[PDB]
Write a protein that binds this ligand. Structure first.
Ligand code: BGC
Ligand code: BGC
Ligand code: BGC
Ligand code: BGC
Ligand code: BGC
Ligand code: BGC
Ligand code: BGC
Ligand code: BGC
Ligand code: BGC
Ligand code: GLC
Ligand code: CA
Length: 1032
C-alpha cells in the first residue's frame, strides 16, 4: 500500500494490482495524497472542512477566497489562481499535467492526455480527425478548444454519439463529439467473503423486484450463504433475501456514496473518508464491514423491513438512497431540449436480443412528427391499425352497440394530433369512411360526414383527396393583426388572403369561383389553441401554480381574474377584437367556421350558465350568416386601414352580376378597423361596394360599434342606410340621417379596439335561408370535399372548454345540458356539433389533460362513462345527447385520439433512447439502455370490445384489410429561407389481420413513452462489458 523509500519519501502501490501510483491522487485512511508523476512522491492535501460557497467561489473560516487545487469534504476541486472562480466542465494543470473536473459539482475525476488549441479538424475516410500543431493525429481523451473529446487510439477517428470507457471512467460524447463525465467504474471483490454473497442460483425464485427476468436497483436476492448475527456463516434458506446493492454496485460513485450513507446512518464506524480516489480494496473491505452491521441488526430486528426503508424509501424529506444516485434518477436522463415539448421529452423504443416480448419490426413514424406525450402508440403496426379500425367502428356505432339505439351514433371524426400518427392509419381511416358512408360519391354524402384534422396543409394524407377539412391560417393572421393591444397589431392587409407557408388556401379579394379553395375550417380559439396558455398565465399570476398542475380552488381564482380581464377594455391576458374576428370567420367565403364554447360562455360558471361578454354579437353574426351570407366575395383595405368585406348574395359571384330574385335581400357588408384612435377627416368617405344587384337599396345594421361596446340587431328594426345608384353604401365621421352609432371612428372598449360594423339588406322574409343544399351530383375529380356554397353552408361548434368546473349535480353535467339545449344550436345554424373526447380521464395529473380531465388523457379508450360519469356524463347521458343533437338536425363528431394512452400500471423492459417530438434520436449521456416502462394495461372496456368487430368488418369491407398503394402531399422545407413546397409522395400500406385483439396494451405496440425518471442504469448490468443480468 503506502511505502517509504530509502530517502524516507512516501510512495503508493495499488492494493489490488501492485502498480505504483504516479501522477494521481489517492485517499488513504482519511488523508488525500497526491503522488508526483515523475518520482511518485507523496504530497498531503490538507482537508478543508469549515468555510462556505458563495460569490461561484469558496471561502475559509477566515472569510478568505481559496485558489488552486483544494481538498474540500472528500472531493478535489479547483479554483482559478487569479479570480478564484470554481472550475466545472474543464481541465486544470497540476504537477505539469492535466486533470478533468466534472461539470456537476466540479469534482476531479480523471487525467486528460493533452490540451489543444492550435490544430485543425480534418476528414479522412469519411471520419473526422484532429491534427495537432505538427500536423499529427491526436489520440485518446483530450480537450480541444476547451471541449472534452475522444479519438480512437488506433485510427484517430473522433468518437461521436457514444458512451466510452477510458482508464476506468465512463464518458459520453455527443453528436458534435463534445464529452461529459458520467461515472467512475469499479475496478473490481475476488475474495472468499464475496464468494459467499454470490447468488444461490439464477432462477426466478431467488430474486424479487424483477421485470421480464431483468434485475433492477430495487432487487433483493437470496445468496449462497448468510453471515448470521454478523458472526456465523450458514447456508441460506428460501426465506433469506438481501438487497443486491449491499453486495454489488454498478459504479464507484454508487459504492462510495453507499458507504458514506451507511456512515451517516450509523452502520459503519470509521474515520476513513471515502472518495472517488479511495483504493477499491479498501472500499470493498468497508462494504464487508457494513454487511456485518446489517446482519447483526437483522438478527436484532428479527426481520429486514428497516433495511427496506433505509435504502429504498424517502427519509427526512430527502430522496431515497437509490434516488440520490445519478444513474438511478432523472439527471442521467437529460430531460428537456427544444424538441422536448411536454413532460421533459421522450424515450423511443428499440430492439434487443434479450427482450423478445417488447421487440418490434415496426415503430416507423410515417409522418412529420412522432412523440407528444404519455405512451405513444405505434400506429404503423398492422395489429394496431386493425385495432384503430375496431375503435373507429365502435365510436361510429356507439349507440347501436351499447343500447341498440341507432340514432345515438357519431357521424364524423376529428383526428387529434394528426401529424403525430402514421399516414397508413390515416389513409385507412379514410377508406373506412368511404366504405361506410360513401362520402366519395357526391357532395350530398360527403357533407353528411364532415370530418376534420388538427393541422393545416401539412396534413398531406388529408389534403390529397380532401377527405377532411384542414385548419385555415385565419387564426394566425388574426393573431398578428387584430388580437393585440393598441400599437402591437399589424395591418389588416394580411387578412385579404388565407395563406399557409406561402401556399394559398383561398383569396378573399375577388372570390367569384367555386371548388377552387382547399376545404378548410377557420377559428380563432379552441380548447387548446390560444387559450390554455393565457389562462395558465392568470392562474400562475393570481396564485402561484404551474399551468399543467394546480388545485380546483387555484383554478377558480385564476378564472375569476381571467374574466375580470376579459371584460375590461385593457387586457393583459385576453385577446382583443374577438367579435371582429368572428365577423370575418362567419362572413368569409370558402371556409367552414368553428365556434368556440369559451368565446360564448365563461368557465367561472357551470356548462352554459354564464354568458361571455361576446355572446350577443356572436349570436347576431351566426343569425345573419344563415339569413344572408352567400354568393361571391370581395375584400380590400382602404387608405384609412379599414378592411371592407362584401358578400353579394346567392347567385351573384361578382360586383357586376345582376343575380336573381333571391339575391336582392341577401349578401352583406363588413367594415373592420384595428386602430382605436382612428378619425377620418370631415371630407373622407368609407365605401362598401355592395354590387349591381343592390342598387338604390335600404340596408340595416347587424352590428354597430358604440362607446361602451356593440349594438346588435337581429331584425330590420335597426339604423338604416341606403346604397346609391351604383350599389355603394357610403359612410363618414358623421351620422347617417341623424342616427347614433352610424359614424366611423376608432373606439376602445371591451368588445372592440378599432371599429366594427356589419350591414345587411332590408326586406328579407322571416324564413329567409341563404344556405345552399348539397347536390347528389357524382364527383369525378377524386376529391371527397369541395369548397363551395353548400360546404360553406356548414358551421361547426366546439362544445367544450378545458377549464369547465366539475358538475355538482346530474343537471349540471355538460352532456345533459347539451341535450336540453339542442334547439338553441340549430337556431344558430350549427350543422356539426363537435363534442369533447368522451373517454374517461386517467386522473393521473401528469399533464393538464389529466388534471382537468377533458378526455384527451385516458387509459381505457372504450370507456365513455359506464357506471360512473366522465366529466361530461355517463354513457346513457352521451347517447341521449347524440340523439337530441340528431333530432335537432346536427351531425356529431367523435374526437379520435389514436396518438397515445396514459397510466398503464404494468411494467415491462424495453430498449430506449432519448428522442424529441420528431422521432429524432437525441444525443445524450443516457445513450441507449434497457428501461423499465409503464406499458401494460388498458381497462375493462378495452378487454370487452377491442378486436371484437374485426371479423365482421373483414367480411363486410375486405378491402380495408388488404394492402394498398396511395398518394399524398409531402411538405418540404427549403433551408435557403424561402417558403415550403409540396411534392407528391407514394405510400403502400400493409395488409392487416382480423384475429389478433389488443385486449390490453403492451410495449410491442408502442413507439415510446415520456421520460419516467428511473435513470440510465435502473435495469442492472455490468458496465465494464455492457451485459445485462437476465434470469432463467
Ligand atoms: O448531475 C449533473 C451533471 O453531472 C455531471 O458529472 C455530468 O457530466 C452531467 O452530464 C450532469 O448534468
Ligand atoms: O492505486 C490506488 C487507487 O488510486 C486511485 O487514484 C484510483 O482512483 C483507484 O481506482 C485506485 O485503487
Ligand atoms: O426477511 C425475514 C427474515 O430474514 C432472515 O434472513 C432472518 O434471519 C430472519 O430472522 C428474518 O425474520
Ligand atoms: O422487508 C423485507 C422484504 O423487503 C421486500 O421489499 C423485499 O422485496 C423482500 O425480498 C424482503 O424479504
Ligand atoms: O414521412 C411523411 C412525412 O414526412 C415529413 O417530412 C413531411 O413534412 C410530411 O408532410 C410527411 O407526412
Ligand atoms: O393529446 C395531447 C394534446 O394533443 C392535442 O392534439 C389536443 O388538441 C390537446 O388538447 C392535447 O392536450
Ligand atoms: O403553417 C401554419 C399552419 O399551421 C397549422 O398547424 C395550423 O393548424 C394552421 O392554422 C396554420 O395555417
Ligand atoms: O330529443 C330526443 C328525442 O328523442 C325521441 O326518441 C323522443 O321520443 C322525443 O320526444 C325527443 O324529441
Ligand atoms: O345535420 C347535418 C346537415 O349537414 C349539411 O351540411 C347537410 O348537407 C345537410 O343535409 C344536413 O341537414
Ligand atoms: O469546429 C468545431 C467542430 O468541428 C468539427 O466539426 C468537429 O466534429 C467538432 O468536434 C467540432 O466542435
Ligand atoms: Ca405518435
Amino acid at each position: 500500500g503506502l511505502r517509504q523509500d530509502s530517502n524516507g519519501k512516501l510512495r503508493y502501490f495499488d492494493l489490488t494490482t501492485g502498480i505504483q501510483a504516479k501522477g494521481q491522487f489517492v485517499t488513504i485512511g482519511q488523508e488525500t495524497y497526491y503522488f508526483s508523476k515523475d518520482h511518485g512522491d507523496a504530497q498531503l492535501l490538507p482537508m478543508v472542512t469549515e468555510g462556505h460557497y458563495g460569490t461561484w467561489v469558496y471561502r475559509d473560516q477566515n472569510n478568505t477566497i481559496l485558489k488552486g487545487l483544494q481538498n474540500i469534504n472528500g472531493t478535489l476541486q479547483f479554483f482559478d489562481p487569479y479570480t478564484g472562480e470554481q472550475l466545472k466542465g474543464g481541465v486544470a494543470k497540476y504537477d505539469d499535467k492535466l486533470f478533468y473536473f466534472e461539470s456537476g459539482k466540479g469534482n476531479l475525476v480523471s487525467t486528460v492526455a493533452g490540451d489543444y488549441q492550435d490544430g485543425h479538424y480534418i476528414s479522412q475516410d469519411g471520419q473526422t480527425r484532429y491534427a495537432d500543431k505538427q500536423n499529427q493525429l491526436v489520440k485518446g481523451l483530450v480537450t480541444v478548444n476547451g471541449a472534452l473529446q475522444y479519438f480512437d487510439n488506433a485510427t484517430g477517428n473522433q468518437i461521436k454519439n457514444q458512451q466510452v470507457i477510458v482508464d476506468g471512467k465512463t464518458y459520453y460524447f455527443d453528436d458534435k463529439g463534445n464529452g461529459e463525465y458520467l461515472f467512475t467504474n469499479t475496478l473490481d471483490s475476488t475474495n472468499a467473503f464475496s464468494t459467499k454473497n454470490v447468488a444461490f442460483n439464477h432462477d426466478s425464485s431467488s430474486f424479487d423486484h424483477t421485470v421480464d427476468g431483468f434485475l433492477t436497483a430495487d432487487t433483493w436476492y437470496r445468496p449462497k450463504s448468510i453471515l448470521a448475527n454478523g458472526t456465523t456463516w450458514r447456508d441460506s434458506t428460501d426465506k433469506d433475501m438481501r438487497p443486491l446493492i449491499t453486495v454489488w454496485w454498478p459504479n464507484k460513485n454508487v459504492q462510495v456514496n453507499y458507504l458514506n450513507f451507511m456512515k451517516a446512518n450509523g452502520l459503519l464506524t470509521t474515520a476513513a473518508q471515502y472518495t472517488l480516489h479511495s483504493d477499491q480494496y479498501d472500499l470493498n473491505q468497508a462494504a464487508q464491514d457494513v454487511q456485518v452491521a446489517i446482519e447483526r441488526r437483522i438478527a436484532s430486528e428479527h426481520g429486514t423491513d428497516w433495511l427496506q426503508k433505509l435504502l429504498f424509501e424517502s427519509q427526512n424529506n430527502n430522496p431515497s438512497f437509490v434516488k440520490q444516485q445519478f444513474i438511478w434518477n432523472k439527471d442521467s436522463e437529460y430531460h428537456g431540449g427544444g424538441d422536448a415539448w411536454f413532460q421533459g421529452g421522450y424515450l423511443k423504443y428499440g430492439n434487443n436480443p434479450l427482450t423478445p416480448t417488447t421487440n418490434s419490426d415496426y415503430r416507423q413514424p410515417g409522418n412529420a412528427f412522432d412523440f407528444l406525450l404519455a405512451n405513444d402508440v405505434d400506429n404503423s403496426n398492422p395489429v394496431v391499425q386493425a385495432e384503430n379500425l375496431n375503435w373507429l367502428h365502435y365510436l361510429m356505432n356507439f349507440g347501436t352497440i351499447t343500447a341498440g339505439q341507432d340514432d345515438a351514433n357519431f357521424d364524423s371524426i376529428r383526428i387529434d394530433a394528426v401529424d403525430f400518427i402514421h399516414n397508413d392509419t390515416i389513409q385507412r381511416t379514410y377508406d373506412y369512411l368511404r366504405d361506410a358512408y360513401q362520402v366519395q360519391q357526391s357532395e350530398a354524402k360527403a357533407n353528411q360526414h364532415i370530418s376534420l384534422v388538427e393541422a393545416g396543409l401539412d396534413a398531406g394524407t388529408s389534403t390529397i383527396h380532401n377527405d377532411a377539412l384542414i385548419e385555415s391560417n385565419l387564426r394566425e393572421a388574426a393573431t398578428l393583426s387584430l388580437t393585440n393591444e393598441p400599437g402591437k397589431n399589424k395591418p389588416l392587409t394580411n387578412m385579404l388572403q388565407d395563406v399557409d407557408g406561402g401556399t394559398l388556401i383561398t383569396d378573399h379579394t375577388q372570390n367569384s369561383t367555386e371548388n377552387q379553395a382547399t376545404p378548410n375550417y377557420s377559428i380563432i380559439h379552441a380548447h387548446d389553441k390560444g387559450v390554455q396558455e393565457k389562462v395558465g398565465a392568470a392562474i400562475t399570476d393570481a396564485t402561484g401554480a404551474d399551468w399543467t398542475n394546480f388545485t380546483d380552488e387555484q383554478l377558480k381564482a385564476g378564472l375569476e381574474l381571467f374574466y375580470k380581464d376579459q371584460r375590461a377594455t385593457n387586457k393583459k391576458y385576453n385577446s382583443y377584437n374577438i367579435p371582429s374576428i368572428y365577423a370575418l370567420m362567419l362572413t368569409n367565403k370558402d371556409t367552414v367556421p368553428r365556434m368556440y364554447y369559451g368565446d360564448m360562455y365563461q368557465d367561472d360558471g357551470q356548462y352554459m350558465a354564464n354568458k361571455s361578454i361576446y355572446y350577443d354579437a356572436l349570436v347576431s353574426l351566426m343569425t345573419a350568416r344563415k339569413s344572408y351570407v352567400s354568393g361571391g366575395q370581395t375584400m380590400s383595405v382602404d387608405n384609412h386601414g379599414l378592411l371592407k368585406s362584401v358578400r353579394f348574395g346567392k347567385d351573384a359571384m361578382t360586383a357586376n352580376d345582376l343575380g336573381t330574385s333571391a339575391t336582392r335581400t341577401e349578401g352583406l357588408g363588413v367594415i373592420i378597423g384595428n386602430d382605436p384612435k382612428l378619425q377620418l377627416n370631415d371630407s373622407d368617405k368609407v365605401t362598401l361596394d355592395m354590387g349591381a344587384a343592390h342598387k338604390n337599396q335600404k340596408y340595416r345594421a347587424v352590428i354597430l360599434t358604440t362607446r361602451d361596446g356593440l349594438a346588435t340587431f337581429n331584425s330590420d328594426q335597426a339604423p338604416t342606410a341606403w346604397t346609391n345608384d351604383q350599389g355603394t353604401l357610403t359612410f363618414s365621421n358623421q351620422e347617417i340621417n341623424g342616427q347614433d352609432n352610424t359614424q366611423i371612428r376608432g373606439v376602445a372598449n371591451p368588445q372592440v379596439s378599432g371599429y366594427l360594423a356589419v350591414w345587411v339588406p332590408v326586406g328579407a322574409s322571416d324564413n329567409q335561408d341563404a344556405r345552399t343544399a348539397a347536390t347528389t351530383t357524382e364527383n369525378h375529380d377524386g376529391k371527397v370535399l369541395h369548397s363551395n356554397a353548400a360546404l360553406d353552408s356548414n358551421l361547426i361548434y366546439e362544445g367544450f372548454s378545458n377549464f369547465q368546473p366539475k358538475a355538482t349535480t346530474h343537471d349540471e353535467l355538460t352532456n345533459v345540458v347539451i341535450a336540453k339545449n339542442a334547439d338553441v344550436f340549430n337556431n344558430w345554424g350549427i350543422t356539426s356539433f363537435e363534442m369533447a373526447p368522451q373517454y374517461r380521464s386517467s386522473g393521473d395529473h401528469t399533464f393538464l389533460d389529466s388534471t382537468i380531465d377533458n378526455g384527451y388523457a385516458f387509459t381505457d379508450r372504450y370507456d365513455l362513462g359506464f357506471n360512473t360519469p366522465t366529466k361530461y356524463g355517463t354513457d346513457g347521458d352521451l347517447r341521449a345527447t347524440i340523439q337530441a343533437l340528431h333530432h335537432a338536425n346536427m351531425q356529431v363528431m367523435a374526437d379520435v385520439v389514436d396518438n397515445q394512452v396514459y397510466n398503464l400500471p404494468g411494467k415491462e423492459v424495453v430498449s430506449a433512447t432519448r428522442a424529441g417530438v420528431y422521432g429524432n434520436d437525441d444525443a445524450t449521456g443516457f445513450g441507449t439502455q434497457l428501461y423499465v416502462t409503464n406499458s401494460v394495461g388498458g381497462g375493462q372496456y378495452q378487454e370487452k370490445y377491442a378486436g371484437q368487430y374485426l371479423e365482421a368488418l373483414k367480411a363486410k369491407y375486405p378491402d380495408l384489410f388488404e394492402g394498398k398503394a396511395y398518394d399524398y402531399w409531402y411538405k418540404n422545407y427549403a433551408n435557403d429561407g424561402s417558403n415550403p413546397y409540396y411534392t407528391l409522395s407514394h405510400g403502400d400500406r400493409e395488409s392487416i389481420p382480423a384475429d389478433v385483439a389488443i385486449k390490453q396494451w403492451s410495449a410491442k405496440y408502442m413507439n415510446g413513452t415520456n421520460v419516467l425518471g428511473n435513470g440510465m442504469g435502473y435495469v442492472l448490468k455490468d458496465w465494464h462489458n455492457g451485459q445485462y443480468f437476465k434470469l432463467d
